[PDB]
Amino acid sequence: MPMQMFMQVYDEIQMFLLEELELKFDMDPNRVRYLRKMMDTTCLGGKYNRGLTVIDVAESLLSLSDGARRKRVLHDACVCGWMIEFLQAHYLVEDDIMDNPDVTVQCAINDGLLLKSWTHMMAMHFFADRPFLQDLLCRFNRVDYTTAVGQLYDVTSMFDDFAEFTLSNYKRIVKYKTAYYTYLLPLVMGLIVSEALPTVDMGVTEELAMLMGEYFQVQDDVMDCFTPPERLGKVGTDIQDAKCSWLAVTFLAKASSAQVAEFKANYGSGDSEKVATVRRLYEEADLQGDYVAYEAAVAEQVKELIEKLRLCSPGFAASVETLWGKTY
Amino acid sequence: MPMQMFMQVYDEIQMFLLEELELKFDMDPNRVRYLRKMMDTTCLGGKYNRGLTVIDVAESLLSLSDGARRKRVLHDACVCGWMIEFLQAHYLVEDDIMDNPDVTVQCAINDGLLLKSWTHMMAMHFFADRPFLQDLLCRFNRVDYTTAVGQLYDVTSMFDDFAEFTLSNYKRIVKYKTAYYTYLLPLVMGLIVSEALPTVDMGVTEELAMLMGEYFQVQDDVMDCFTPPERLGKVGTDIQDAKCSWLAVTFLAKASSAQVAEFKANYGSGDSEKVATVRRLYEEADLQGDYVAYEAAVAEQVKELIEKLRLCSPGFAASVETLWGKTY
Numbered sequence A, B: 001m002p003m004q005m006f007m008q009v010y011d012e013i014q015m016f017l018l019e020e021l022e023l024k025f026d027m028d029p030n031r032v033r034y035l036r037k038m039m040d041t042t043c044l045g046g047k048y049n050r051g052l053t054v055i056d057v058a059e060s061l062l063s064l065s066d067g068a069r070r071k072r073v074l075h076d077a078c079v080c081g082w083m084i085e086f087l088q089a090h091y092l093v094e095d096d097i098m099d100n101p102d103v104t105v106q107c108a109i110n111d112g113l114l115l116k117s118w119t120h121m122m123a124m125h126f127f128a129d130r131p132f133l134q135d136l137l138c139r140f141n142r143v144d145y146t147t148a149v150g151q152l153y154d155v156t157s158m159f160d161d162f163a164e165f166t167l168s169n170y171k172r173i174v175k176y177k178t179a180y181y182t183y184l185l186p187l188v189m190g191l192i193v194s195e196a197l198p199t200v201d202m203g204v205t206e207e208l209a210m211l212m213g214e215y216f217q218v219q220d221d222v223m224d225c226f227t228p229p230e231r232l233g234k235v236g237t238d239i240q241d242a243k244c245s246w247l248a249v250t251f252l253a254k255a256s257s258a259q260v261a262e263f264k265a266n267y268g269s270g271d272s273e274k275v276a277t278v279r280r281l282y283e284e285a286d287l288q289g290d291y292v293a294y295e296a297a298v299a300e301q302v303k304e305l306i307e308k309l310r311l312c313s314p315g316f317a318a319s320v321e322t323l324w325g326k327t328y
């Protein structure tokens, strides 16, 4: 059911943004319609996992001490959810510019800029009189900066060659690039709108967000290599791109000197046979044995930290449980 | 003299940003040094016109009702100045991405993102306890959105063909794309730090910013066409790019049906002879006569509006005069 509410609030945000351009920024109808279409193309289609997490946190926090406050909290949760979905839309556009007087490139750069600006525009309007507006803006922008920093860690992982191919550096990339905006931010925004931010142990929450991010990334990295092409997914290019993947860092700790030498000579190449040699190396190293156990250990840690969180924040722990269920 | 202070505050901002990454964001020395170099390459070298304008406004507002407040206002003026210089650095990087697993493109996208995030990071830190922080952030982000909107008006001026080649649409592009962040924003930030924002007629100020922007753009457009290549400047491509320039909109209102037809068949082409045909058309249409008079009329309007501003905001009008002197 929260999906119907989330989509209704999208119509409300879209109409505000588009009317603001038409009425305050001198926008002609042709450009307004172009922006409506661009917003729909970039912001709709996904699973809305980050957005829906905000809704789920707010409704759980109504249980622990209905009226005029309830309606407001749920509406606020939906606007916050769209801020994260538009920020995600902004990141995807920026990633698509990497797919390599070109009007498509000009428009993609511009779309990226507008989608980011729209997160600030919708916040400043819908939360104009809220006392949490300043803290919300500063936490949102710090997470956005964290993601850009995470992107630098990722993009330069193979540059200065395999010195940064460690589990602790893998965890640094995961934390900054994905965990903060995908797991921590939706949870924090749900706490902000509910005015229940100081009532939770931030340490355990951050640790849970980082762990769920790490669980998801290991699974994503494994699927990037072994999940069949357009049969069971999308195009996996981590091997070709020489990414600091969980498979790569685990292989380097389990491989012999000669196998490491063989991995180094075949990794980071577009050549089909070199990619296949890497896949054969992962298979022969019994990394799928290690994958199962790594994930199971992380899962045990997640399940344990939710219990510590439940002792002082019960309603919140059940929303952290449903977010985890979506990952597990 | 304000340049020495502006550069000293740059060292202070740079060290804060870089140390924050090292101490709070787990950044390794190699990446910290890479970011120091990138910040220097993108933020230094220019004339610092936008940045220095903030300093000049604040020092003028100390004259109208020294102590602990003076030192603070001038430091605040310098941080605001660097926010605009870094935002300008962000726009230039974004424009350079338009110059068309590429690590240069990955890094340019990332640099763009970091430079924008740095404007928010330096503001949230240096103005942490200031009551103007929320208003400053919202005005800065609205000007940033305005610039992205201006970029859409510019990039699509020749698309939907010459229906948008009007003086009023030219003025719309100038206002949003350049006037708000180059003229209005430095003036507004100097007012914010001086806590003198409601003491000025915003209407006359906005009008002055738009007029100074329009004066500058007309001169810039004329130079883009007639200023010799690397002899007296840089590479001018408005004709090839089919830009909605002042020369193009003025020519279309002064040209005969056959000349308009000749302009339409030769505009927006990379071919050297078609560009030369356009230059010949501008020369033959005596647009240089019109240019002199257009600028002189705008100058008279600027000089008149400063007087209306001086009646209620005297110190401010003299800083608006020096900003104008830099343009004229």
Ligand SMILES: Clc1cccc(CNC2CCN(Cc3c[nH]c4ccccc34)CC2)c1
Residues within 6 Å of the ligand: A154, A170, A173, A174, A177, A178, A217, A220, A221, A223, A224, A227, A232, A233, A234, A235, A236, A237, A238, A243, A244, A245, A246
């Ligand atoms: Cl955070 C981090 C840290 C270190 C390295 C990386 C590398 N990132 C790749 C990016 C592409 N895949 C997604 C994907 C592609 N093909 C699939 C098939 C099936 C399912 C998912 C996919 C995820 C892993 C990320």
Ligand SMILES: Clc1cccc(CNC2CCN(Cc3c[nH]c4ccccc34)CC2)c1
Residues within 6 Å of the ligand: B154, B170, B173, B174, B177, B178, B217, B220, B221, B223, B224, B227, B232, B233, B234, B235, B236, B237, B238, B243, B244, B245, B246
């Ligand atoms: Cl805002 C707006 C509105 C409509 C159209 C435009 C077109 N913009 C061009 C951009 C490039 N030039 C700068 C430049 C290039 N060569 C030179 C030689 C000498 C001096 C300056 C230059 C400015 C004009 C902008």
